[PDB]
Design a protein around this ligand. Sequence first.
Ligand code: SF4
Length: 553
Amino acid sequence: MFCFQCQETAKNTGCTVKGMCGKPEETANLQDLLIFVLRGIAIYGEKLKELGQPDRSNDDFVLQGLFATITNANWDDARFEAMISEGLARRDKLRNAFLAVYKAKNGKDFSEPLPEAATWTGDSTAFAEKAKSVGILATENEDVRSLRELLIIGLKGVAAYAEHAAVLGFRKTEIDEFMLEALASTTKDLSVDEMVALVMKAGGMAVTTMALLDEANTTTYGNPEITQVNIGVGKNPGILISGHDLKDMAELLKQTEGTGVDVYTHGEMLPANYYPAFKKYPHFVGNYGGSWWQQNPEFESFNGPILLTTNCLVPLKKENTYLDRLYTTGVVGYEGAKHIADRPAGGAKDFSALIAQAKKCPPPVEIETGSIVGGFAHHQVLALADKVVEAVKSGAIKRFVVMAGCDGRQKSRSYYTEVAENLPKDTVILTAGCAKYRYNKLNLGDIGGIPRVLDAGQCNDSYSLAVIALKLKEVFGLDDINDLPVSYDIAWYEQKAVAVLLALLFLGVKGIRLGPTLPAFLSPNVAKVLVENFNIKPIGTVQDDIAAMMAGK
Ligand code: SF4
């Protein structure tokens, strides 16, 4: 196999036998074959748009297919085989439509050679063998490979956010059109300038999409607000909801009300605690456990059903006993785990089986007590702008350090905990995404009532951090966003974090420290372009990076 899309890739060059995440060769290869089919859909879908007859019937299929290939999202080979077969049928429909339109417009049959993605077909028996030859290493030129894969990796992060926006009824034609433009580009021989421009256009579409999801979430569930979240447990059985999807949360809360089954969040569902629409339910206890990578012992000790709305779902250890109470939904899949089917349009998902099962389970084992404070998304922080601005002017807050991003298992990530613990006491950490778990259970206190860790929410809520920075740029009358007293020390793991990075680069942020390692998918020449254009830096020692950041460097 070959896969190098997450921070944990083997030797920081690429997984070749079995993924460090657990992804087997067969699964990895099927994900490659799906992306190949998506490129075929894109070839025709882009041409139909160019001919003045766009077809948007595959918008949801494309978003969900990309999302299913994100790290820790879907482990069920049958789901991939089904998507590949459906994708081939969708592609052929577009092809037939295209051939007719082309003939009408040109007075002749289409006869130009096309990439194999546009024409290859087979039944499911043929998938495993074909998959071996349509992966990443089929691009021989290392720089073209780097730029094509950087594009696809950012694109699938954008697709995840777009899917959540679509679930909530929010969509923009430019997003769906760009999915096909970007996918199709990876089958064309383009100049370096053209390939880099596509990556920067993806960063701009990440801004669009992150803004759309921010709109979708807050319009539907209210603006996040300051909230104290219990991390201890109650005395009823519970259901633990993980991942990112807030519509799934809304439905789970409604369906569990009055049943005697409590609801707890996990991981990237922690920010559901911050939304007014959800805070109104007394049986919503709080947040259980830590970061995604600790889930094997924590899902075990939770004792009740676990619902995965998105990644990250980690494979079970041999000794784990919770498969029978593990539920997947949306793009998530796992062999042997019960899947909750998509809601009908205008309707809701059916979580009744989780509720019936939870009633048969013991309450969660308490693994800690206390609380987490959060809910500092853009509306809440801008509501406190006068207070924040005065603290900056008085010197009570000397600097903000953006430590948003995504966590992982490597021990080198102790760096983030140690930076948080050793930053001077007149600094404030701004966070969003599971990177927060390296420092959100410390006792850093507050500065004049402003907590020293301000959690804006999920990784998508990095959008709020950009809104806040842009507000502060305006208040302080600065010409360049980089001249604010803000440093960026971002942790990444998977593809959504890469989309957030590209959005920040599109917004003009320079000097970002990215860690705990730099992506394997940046070739030496591409890495050099990014360094020269954007001053991206690797992490150094805790002492050196704190001293540099405090100097604004
Ligand atoms: S998702 Fe990450 S750990 Fe898993 S196979 Fe790909 S690069 Fe390796």
